[PDB]
Amino acid sequence: SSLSTAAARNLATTTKTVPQMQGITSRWLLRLLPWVQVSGGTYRVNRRAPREYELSVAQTVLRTHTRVGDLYNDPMNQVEEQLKLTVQALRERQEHEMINNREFGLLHNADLKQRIPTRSGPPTPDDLDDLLATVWKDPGFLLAHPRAIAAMAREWSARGLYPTAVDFHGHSLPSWRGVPIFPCNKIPVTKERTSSILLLRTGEEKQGVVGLHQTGIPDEYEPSLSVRFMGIDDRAVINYLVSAYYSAAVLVPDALGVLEDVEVGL
């Protein structure tokens, strides 16, 4: 019964699948942020000396054995799958740097007048209204941690408020006064169980937060991402350099607002 079935499997093929990554998340900042093309890796912003923006690089070395690249290509190209997973990891760390970097990160490039605290510590609807009023000109969307979103929803339930869920493209999302709320785990949660909420206006024509990249680069794989052969070493390992160029820019101080010290709760 079982032995016969196993023996039969010995002459059959199993259905496998691409390696599955638990880490892969919904990189909402990359999808929502408009991307403006820069030349020479430099972008000038005339602010009321102009600020200079240099493209940062997220790069890594992909090492693949020569045997893997030669033999294991029958059902699917293993070097291509390794490249896809490498690009996915690159995009994840890009999303992390768009928020947490000390040079162009959103959490650190916010004007001191635009950062506001919470009156009591939980993210009450009053704090949401204050955050909305900070960026009062065409507010694009809110970005928060899942714990933060849970905390705001518990304040809504405690106050007897059921906010309408906006339908953004094919996705239904929570919203506050028409402003869609997007979850992002890259936003830090401190050991005191506190986080931050970001309200953004997006667009170059609206003087909002934009993303900076450079498409067209040579040896390009995906837009603004390039893969280059580096060589084979004495142990017969093929090395590839994969590089993605990216930056962020807030055109005017009022395009970004931060609600700070949000008590998400344990």
Numbering used by the authors: 18 to 65, 252 to 469
Paper text:
Negative stain transmission electron microscopy (TEM) analysis of purified Sl‐Enc1 and Sl‐Enc2 highlighted that Sl‐Enc1 did not assemble into regular encapsulin nanocompartments. Rather, a broad smear is observed, suggesting that Sl‐Enc1 does not assemble into homogeneous protein shells, forming irregular aggregates instead. That is to say, the Sl‐Enc1 majority sample yielded a symmetry‐averaged Sl‐Enc1 shell map while the Sl‐Enc2 majority sample resulted in a symmetry‐averaged Sl‐Enc2 shell density. As Sl‐Enc1 cannot form shells on its own, the obtained symmetry‐averaged Sl‐Enc1 map has to be treated as artifactual. However, we were able to use this map to build an atomic model of the Sl‐Enc1 protomer. The second major difference between the Sl‐Enc1 and Sl‐Enc2 protomers is that their CBDs show different relative orientations with respect to the HK97‐domain with the Sl‐Enc1 CBD being tilted by ca. 23° compared to the Sl‐Enc2 CBD. Thus, Sl‐Enc1 protomers can exist in two different states, one with clearly resolved N‐arms – as also observed in the symmetry‐averaged consensus refinement – and one with completely unresolved N‐arms.
Encapsulins are a prevalent protein‐based compartmentalization strategy in prokaryotes. In this work, we report the characterization of a Family 2B two‐component encapsulin shell identified in Streptomyces lydicus (Sl). Through heterologous expression and purification studies, we show the differential assembly behavior of the two shell components – Sl‐Enc1 and Sl‐Enc2 – and demonstrate their ability to co‐assemble into mixed shells with variable shell composition.
